[PDB]
Design a protein around this ligand. Sequence first.
Ligand SMILES: Nc1ncnc2c1ncn2[C@@H]1O[C@H](COP(=O)(O)OP(=O)(O)NP(=O)(O)O)[C@@H](O)[C@H]1O
Ligand SMILES: Nc1ncnc2c1ncn2[C@@H]1O[C@H](COP(=O)(O)OP(=O)(O)NP(=O)(O)O)[C@@H](O)[C@H]1O
Ligand SMILES: [Mg+2]
Ligand SMILES: [Mg+2]
Ligand SMILES: [Zn+2]
Lengths: 97, 177, 611, 616, 193, 61, 197
Amino acid sequence: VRKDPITKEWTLEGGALVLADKGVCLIDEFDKMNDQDRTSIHEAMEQQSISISKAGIVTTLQARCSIIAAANPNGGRYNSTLPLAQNVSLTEPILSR
Amino acid sequence: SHMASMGYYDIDDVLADGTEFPCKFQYDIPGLGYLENNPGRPITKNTKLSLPLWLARILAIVGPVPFVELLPPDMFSTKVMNAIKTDPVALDLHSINSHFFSLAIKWIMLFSEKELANVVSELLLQRAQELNHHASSLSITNIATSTFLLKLEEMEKEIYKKSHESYKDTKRWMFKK
Amino acid sequence: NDDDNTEIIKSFKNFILEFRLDSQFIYRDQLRNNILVKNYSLTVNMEHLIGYNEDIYKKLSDEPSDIIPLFETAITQVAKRISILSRASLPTFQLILNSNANQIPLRDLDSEHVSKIVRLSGIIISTSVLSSRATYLSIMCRNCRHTTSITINNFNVSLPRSCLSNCGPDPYIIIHESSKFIDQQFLKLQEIPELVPVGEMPRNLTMTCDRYLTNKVIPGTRVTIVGIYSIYNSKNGVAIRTPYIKILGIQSDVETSSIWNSVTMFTEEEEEEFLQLSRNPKLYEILTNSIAPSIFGNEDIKKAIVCLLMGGSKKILPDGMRLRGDINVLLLGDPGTAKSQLLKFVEKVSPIAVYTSGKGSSAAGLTASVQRDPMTREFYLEGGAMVLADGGVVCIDEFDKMRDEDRVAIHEAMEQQTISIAKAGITTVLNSRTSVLAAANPIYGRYDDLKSPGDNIDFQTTILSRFDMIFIVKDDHNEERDISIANHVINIHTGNANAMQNQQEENGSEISIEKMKRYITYCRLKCAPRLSPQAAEKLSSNFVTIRKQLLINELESTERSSIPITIRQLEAIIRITESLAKLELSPIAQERHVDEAIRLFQASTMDAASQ
Amino acid sequence: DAVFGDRVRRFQEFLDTFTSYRDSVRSIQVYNSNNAANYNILPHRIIISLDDLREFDRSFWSGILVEPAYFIPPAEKALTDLADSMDDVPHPNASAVSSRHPWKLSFKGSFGAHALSPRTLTAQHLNKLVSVEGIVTKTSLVRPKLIRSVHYAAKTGRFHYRDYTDATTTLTTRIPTPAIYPTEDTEGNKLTTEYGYSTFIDHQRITVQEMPEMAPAGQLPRSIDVILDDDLVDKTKPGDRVNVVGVFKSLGAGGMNQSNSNTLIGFKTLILGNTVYPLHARAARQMLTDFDIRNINKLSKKKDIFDILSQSLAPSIYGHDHIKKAILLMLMGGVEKNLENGSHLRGDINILMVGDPSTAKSQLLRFVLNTASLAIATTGRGSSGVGLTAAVTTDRETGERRLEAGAMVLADRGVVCIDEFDKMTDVDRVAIHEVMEQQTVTIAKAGIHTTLNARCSVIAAANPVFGQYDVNRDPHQNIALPDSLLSRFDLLFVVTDDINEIRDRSISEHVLRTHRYLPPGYLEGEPVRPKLVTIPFLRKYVQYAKERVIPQLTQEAINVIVKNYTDLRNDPITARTLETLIRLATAHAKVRLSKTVNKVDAKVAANLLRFALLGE
Amino acid sequence: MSLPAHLQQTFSPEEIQFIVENEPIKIFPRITTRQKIRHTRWQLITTDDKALNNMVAMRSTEVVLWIALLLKQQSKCSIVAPQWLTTKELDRKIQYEKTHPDRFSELPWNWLVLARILFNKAKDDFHDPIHELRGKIQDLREIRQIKVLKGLKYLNESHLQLDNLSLLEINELRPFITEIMDKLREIHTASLT
Amino acid sequence: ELLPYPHQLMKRLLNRISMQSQLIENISMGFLDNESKLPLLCMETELERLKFVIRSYIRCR
Amino acid sequence: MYGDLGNKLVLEAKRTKQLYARSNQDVNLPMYHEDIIRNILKEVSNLRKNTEYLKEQQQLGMLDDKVAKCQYFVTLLCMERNKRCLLAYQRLRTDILDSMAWNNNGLDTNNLSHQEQEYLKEYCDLITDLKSGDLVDIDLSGSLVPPSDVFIDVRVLKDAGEIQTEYGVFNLIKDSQFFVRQSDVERLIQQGYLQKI
Ligand SMILES: Nc1ncnc2c1ncn2[C@@H]1O[C@H](COP(=O)(O)OP(=O)(O)NP(=O)(O)O)[C@@H](O)[C@H]1O
Ligand SMILES: Nc1ncnc2c1ncn2[C@@H]1O[C@H](COP(=O)(O)OP(=O)(O)NP(=O)(O)O)[C@@H](O)[C@H]1O
Ligand SMILES: [Mg+2]
Ligand SMILES: [Mg+2]
Ligand SMILES: [Zn+2]
């Protein structure tokens, strides 16, 4: 949500998952995002929406992207003797999406 | 004494007689402390109880100095009389007492009151005009009707249900076989 | 020109007086029925206007702003004839329109539509306070003190520049004592989410309604409008002016009741459907299977969502103490288990609801926020999701990803049913009486069932105790269940489940969203069941057993439990016991309701704590 | 001319008939003649019963209600012409003779459909006499409004005058007089303006908001602006619950002027106030009869009263007798000492309940909020440090820098109920120290430099930092707050929800009785739309015990207080805790309706403090 | 009880139709039942048999209205509307109604009931165009409804007088007028010593 | 009030219903062997109209 | 005090009065309050024990002129009130059973007390005794809607096969339609085998 400098009440600005709606969002170095930033994707993966409730704006945008992500394993190299859940710093709710 | 138009088996008369009125006792009376919710005490003179009308209507008559005085009840206080006299149609009688007209008639019998009989005859005649408008008005309900039916007594709801079904069955007969 | 208006008026008086289908003069009767209950308006269905004389519809649709106010006077002239004795007054009647012209999508409104009657639909995002427009100005001259008046009709006139009979260049003042006024309200309408084009923010119109169309809607309602798409010369480019709608007929889609003091808006043809449905011996099976029919299993979660949609009963003591009647539920569990698909369903069945994500939320955006008005420069208060969802359900998805400063704003609004404020010199407690349905994952995503049951769960006992049923939804990999789900899911994609859900509704095994939303809305207005004296003997003997069980489980675990039992959870089992009595419209709650309420609590919060 | 002069004699005949209005006029006139001229002054205003008027002339009464701009003016003229017939005074002064000070009407009772609120008030009500009920907000500053200027014509010796007209001064419309003084006479003589012979009336604008309790589902409170003038000014402050009677009226040209092109905006609307009645029940105080006084006094003699009254607090909440005792003493607060050298000593008991979830901490705050004569609710996340103290604003009537009061200032001589107290931000908790220490807040922003009174008792509720109280950790580990702020509270109660088969059965039966309540006159299943006292009597008892009794500290209680203080301290106790013992003893002496703090009061104070310290 | 509650003190509109169907109406027979001097016969027990055994096609006769409707259900009759169902006589009654606020016009007791029966069953037998007759029956219905609402401002402990009110117009008002005047009487007689 | 019963009237009408209902059956025996059926239809619908008034009368009292 | 059980019985009477008029059908009247009625009859027995325990104590000398003149009279008034509530409840349920006996059984038994199961039988036997006698020519249990109608189209709403009736035989084939005299089918319409009119 943006605040205008003049009329100076609230409005929505769309992010990458709106500007790629009916399209693709490409997320390079997905492992190196902050977990607070990476967990914003969980609604737009399955429900293909973005449900904001901020500054008295309460609404849902559509966000029907395919997401392609690129990551490296823990330590920067894949280690083939370990299970996947130990090769990567991610978790089951985002890995299953 | 009782009037023949209000029946023995008449449920809305049984319920009206159940409502409590404030009562001052004029005597000391052993054993009757269950009226004060403590059987072990006597009743004492100048105790101010509330008794159901089926008990109070009878204790007010016998004892000359009778067992009880009925105190003037909230629902016939000058506040309610003033509210009745300014705007009968706006008044929410169902909040003042659900049985107000049945209780008014019993109070006017129990003490002859030309004053209250005028006020309650007028309240009835003025609200009856609106009962006929809301009963006559048939959809092909509105908020302006539903806001009035919520202001409405258990006596006047009979007149409304009965009058409305009378207009409704007449429309139902005129505008199809 | 007034010869021409007199013929247009005369031709519409004759529409009211002559238009008949079958035996009944439906517009004479509707005028009389509206006069008696004192709403001075007529609703006209435009298929009937086309049926009577299509030249009149042609005139009306060519230039509405000049013909609508001629039909309003034709209505008043008939209204006098049918309700006053001549030779022994009424205000100017409103004309309200119904239509089945094609809905124009809100973003397709453009210069081709200026001044035309336009039918459309959207979500109301805002309603103003009422404002007063004149319909009659009484008038007096400043200088010579001549006096007259101006009748006003509010389509597309001002104080005269001349004294009408030197008297001066701007002679007239308004006599407010003798003037007459009407209510006007502004709405804002956003377009419907499934009609927004790809990647755009949902577009918005301001629009105005007056008289009997004011207060007919609340924020969040989905409406269809008939109105005149039109323009005003705002001071806010060049040769440019702002579009709006003069609303001629709001039509709320589901009979979502608008501003509404629980009043009896139902009709006997649906009330007698509900009063049969209440008495079906299988009703709780029917409502359980009607919750999310495309979601397999989760039977107890569906049973608890039915309880949440009814709620228990709200109570107000002679103490002045207020008891919460609303039921709150937490779906805590493994990934891909239909937690979010159940939240997206309760948003649609509940008569009022808001879906939100805890990650997309703020304390202020959830509760209420202080705005600054750019004209007055004063602060004013705006309602968030808990105020928009008031009297309904707020669905809080991703409740584990909400910030700790934002989750705490919900603590009051989940128990005391208010939103207290002390900001910018505003202070109030706002009412907000909602159920909260919430969905979450454990720490580490899955439940990790070997780890300590308190080390999996992030939430504090302060918020967990505010939930009446907590479901720890574990996913268990039983091959017979996984085949039973696999067959079911494929029947959804292949389009078989569509026909099955249509056949089960026809079989009476299920009810539609529209029927269920109106059934829930009825039960909330006819029932608030009390516990029978024998239901108390069972609920007491149960709750002290649940506390002994908890104390023993704590003595094994060597600590205070992370999922609590407290007296707020006795009131949960009481409140569930009432919800099950609201379903069947019972005036009282009984030993059979207490057995199912203890069972649902056991299957949810207690088996979640037992882990 | 013609109908006005008849309505004047028609109202004159009412005042002759209902002689209590002549008697009320006489009472005001002699009292003012005593206190002004013979020796604090009464307004030239009469409250008429609208019920007396209905019964005298239904056609005047319905004129007053439905056409007041045509019936209140001749009725105020009739009352003014009455008062001038009664008035007698030798050698009246020039300002009296010049005064432009007629008599004003005010009204009682029975408005019917004209009884309204800020939401139900509608354009169909414009130009009618209405009663509106609400909560006051945004009271603007008082300004004098010019209504007559007197001038002196030097070179002639004639005093001239001019009268002035504004759309909020009069019920009827007049051509608006431009607010410019005469500078030169009709003949051409220079005119000098005689202030003090000229007439000004006080004027104030108040916003009356819908009571949030009544607001319909998901809608926010509506409001109306009310105009108050002469003697109605400052009869209200923000947060007052109020009933205002006045003519609802329109203003301005409403965009009908070719200076504007919008065509969607509407007219401005206001209530011109005729009278104001304050409220506090959900009526701002209980007036006490000789019977109320007899009952309060007789009941105070029973040795059990501290139990009777404290059990009658929150009777739906089971247990917590020692916290409910502390709440009764907070309501009947101790005595304030305004000692010299700035040595002001607080009378006000502060209570902090910190504890496990679901223990009625919030349901005892919501009880205090109901039963106290002034109470303000707040919550830790809902409160800014600004909205607790005072907020800078512009007064839109006058264009001027102003303060709005915060919750700690609105609660002056009342209680603040702070729920979620440990969820307050560190910057917002700074504001609470000043109120608790100095009973005042200091403002230094926007070029406003001031000290506001905030003489309120804080009751607060919190949870420990781990969501339930960890008995394996210290109080300063369990409780989130600075120990400096915890020393500003008198009674820090720590409460736990601990499992015990007999107590859990006992509270379980009690809430199952509490949920079984059926309010009188409702049906089964219908949706809502040996000694204890009723809460309306407990509210009278508390009011009496604050308006009638101011106990003096006495040697019998000193011999106890210093014995018990020195025992507590010699085995967190600090110098502040001695003053808590004196407050609790002074508060309990008020519950006994007594002028002296006795040995019994000091023992009950020490037991109640020792319970809060030790968890006895 | 033996009688349903909605019938306990009043007539259903279908019983008010049954009462009106007992009146004589004029018809034009389309059958000759009259035997010549040069066969089944009616033999009725509640009405005059001698009118039906003497029908001659297209010479008018009177029969009871329930037989006219039973003959008109076949092609075997046509029903002659009374003189008051003419656009002239209805328009004189509308003028009377507007001219005399204090009274109802002298329409026959069955006028709404008989208009509704004949407009449905005998729609082709009017000399005037039936859309102008339906229009004036509605004009009369509406004026009398205003005069009724004026009359109800006078509900009384003693009596009312309602001189030319139809049986169907009495029958809709019966459970309101009598129920309210009954409570005004109870409130009054209660005040007496 | 419960009005006094029409004793002789009711005995007369209950004869005519018995005689007329026998007559309608006797006339229906001729139809086994003009032969127009309207008078049979009217004699039958008249007994239904008459039997209704008496049933509605007795059920009321 | 003693009348407060009676008021609960009559509030159930009132709710069944509303229920049976609001709902358009013949509803099944709700189950008899054997428990509330046993509580009321038990309280009347304790008021009887108080009349016995007073009436002896008059001879033992305890100031009966005042004391018994009030105590007997209030004890008796409580029992008048309990009799009225029981009788007002039992008469309403009687009015509904008579309405069933004419309307339906003239052409749910778990809910009735055994005296009402008995009474309903004896009253159905009284109805059949009125119509089985003089006045047999008119079917007293028949319709009170006037016979404005001669022949009617009727659609057969449930299969019932070939059935006899006094006037004739019909094969009630699911969704066939008959055009037949109203007086022959009226009882089959009432039983709900037929649809239209
Ligand atoms: N039991 C089920 N029956 C039918 N569909 C299911 C079922 N379980 C999962 N699905 C489907 O698989 C997807 C599950 O995603 P979703 O409903 O968003 O999972 P969720 O429980 O909210 N998991 P998460 O957000 O990861 O914690 C949806 O498309 C569902 O329709
Ligand atoms: N002793 C009690 N007696 C009766 N009801 C109780 C009692 N203790 C708690 N409750 C009920 O428990 C519920 C929660 O009380 P509340 O005041 O909201 O809890 P609280 O102590 O403030 N807990 P919290 O908000 O989590 O810090 C309310 O419905 C109370 O009435
Ligand atoms: Mg999900
Ligand atoms: Mg709390
Ligand atoms: Zn002029």
